[PDB]
């Protein structure tokens, strides 16, 4: 991605340099003072809160190339009490307290532009999965997570493409043919079902993600 | 507001004039190729969608001031098919092509930032909002609703706190099938009472405690307006 390494640079090239992160630590949490603007290059994380009680929410998932801000770019306190947490074996991400980003956002306004995008995907990538679960129920929800899972971790095989109300959900699927567990492995081969029950996201994909959406399309 | 009215100025000064819309009109629509970024001085909108039925989804309100963008700033593509319509009787909006609004972007610093917290407003908005439907369903989503007003148009009087809103978009929300049925609940335990064409607020710690993400996000996006009410 041409527009995410172009950021790199000038990240590397202003003195931030990438910090490695292993899997369950934390690149930023809900009980610090301070507030970071994240640019995760490589890996997968998952945005969490934690209530007092200690119970975790699993709110979202993050793969890089990607900018995650845990502050409000002017008053530079919290959007909210979360924690940014790797869950792929390792992460490099850049970590800039966020009162320098506005320094080296001044400057050059496409990389502003660039950080200002991926809000915007964010925005549209929640209204697009809210639209399809307030219409085909909790199938609109799974067959977009599995679209979701297709999309991004998705590899052809001639066969198929590899990666409780649900359990019954899933059993229907597997029935309906649309996907196949076959030689222990997951298989996907009625792409098209998927987008059915799914059509916002797999519009939000289309517009957002050209490349990704048209690998298998 | 305070930093949204310098926006208005900002807007002025560079030769955007304020258009004003009626209920029922799309300032956007999913069918214009062109993209815009609409600044929302004052009125009511919501977001919609157009599904293959032909069924109407409301996604999203948005009260001025506010900023809603059709397509993504720097590929000028649209962000998702959506329709901007009216509720409220009038709506004051400012009106600039994709195209346009990058320039005085880049001019100004300041202004961008506001329009990027904008965004980012949004963003942790959808995750609270997420957030308390996986815990309280329906209930969650409609007392956290209720809050958000209460905190926004909420004035303190003796028969509680009257949610000062006209009837037009009262009306819209489904207050005047399943939210119903949680209105009536919220009225048959005495948490909210409609007197006057008016809902008044008798116990907001019920709101907070079935909406708690939603609390935290409106304290930490404008705490001088959560602070009132608390
Ligand atoms: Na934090
Ligand atoms: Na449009």
Redesign the interface.
């Known amino acids: 991605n041409a527009?995410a390494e172009e950021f790199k640079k000038y990240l590397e090239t202003n003195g931030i340099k990438p910090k490695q992160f292993h899997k369950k630590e934390l690149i930023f949490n809900q009980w610090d003072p301070q507030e970071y603007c994240i640019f995760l290059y490589d890996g997968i994380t998952k945005?969490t809160?934690i209530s007092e009680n200690g119970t975790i929410?699993n709110?979202?998932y993050y793969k890089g190339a990607f900018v995650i801000?845990s502050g409000?770019?002017?008053?530079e306190?919290?959007?909210?009490?979360?924690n940014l947490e790797v869950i792929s074996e390792q992460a490099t991400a850049y970590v800039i307290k966020i009162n320098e980003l506005?320094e080296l956002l001044?400057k050059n306004?496409?990389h502003?532009?660039?950080?200002?995008?991926t809000?915007?995907?964010?925005?549209?990538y929640?209204?697009?999965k809210?639209?399809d679960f307030?219409?085909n129920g909790k199938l609109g929800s799974i067959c977009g997570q599995l679209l979701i899972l297709t999309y991004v971790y998705g590899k052809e095989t001639p066969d198929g493409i590899k990666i409780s109300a649900v359990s019954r959900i899933i059993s229907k699927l597997k029935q309906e043919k649309v996907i196949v567990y076959k030689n222990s492995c997951f298989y996907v081969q009625n792409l098209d079902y998927l987008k059915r029950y799914a059509?916002?996201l797999d519009?939000?994909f289309y517009?957002?993600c050209p490349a990704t959406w048209g690998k298998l399309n």
């Open positions: 527009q945005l809160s929410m709110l979202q801000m409000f770019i002017d008053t306190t919290s959007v909210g009490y979360y506005k001044s306004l496409t502003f532009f660039y950080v200002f995008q809000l915007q995907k964010q925005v549209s929640s209204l697009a809210f639209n307030s219409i059509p916002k519009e939000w517009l957002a």
